[PDB]
Design goal:
The chain has a single domain, classed as ACP-like (Non-ribosomal Peptide Synthetase Peptidyl Carrier Protein, Chain A). It is an all-alpha fold and 81 residues long. Helix 1 crosses helix 4. 56% of the residues lie in helices and 0% in strands. The two termini are 16 Å apart. It contains 4 helices and no strands. The protein is globular. It comes from Rickettsia prowazekii (strain Madrid E).
């Protein structure tokens, strides 16, 4: 049995709290960065909430490795020690 599976279905609640994206907007290719025009000073805390929530770390280098629903579950997965 694996718990990570719950992450693939829980991600919706994550991305919804990360960039304040409504559940009716949560999409795999959610480009909130462009559509919502997520500024830099804003992404600082917005993206930070992903570290205090998941309890992991995500440097600028991997900032684009957990932005998408498929990348967040694909990265955080292998990242989860």
């Amino acid at each position: 049995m694996s718990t990570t599976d719950k992450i693939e279905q829980k991600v919706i609640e994550m991305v919804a709290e990360k960039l304040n994206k409504d559940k009716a907007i949560i999409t795999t290719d959610s480009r909130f960065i462009e559509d919502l025009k997520a500024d830099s000073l804003d992404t600082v805390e917005l993206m930070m909430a992903i570290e205090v929530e998941y309890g992991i770390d995500i440097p600028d280098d991997e900032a684009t490795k957990i932005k998408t629903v498929s990348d967040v579950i694909k990265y955080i997965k292998e990242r989860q020690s």
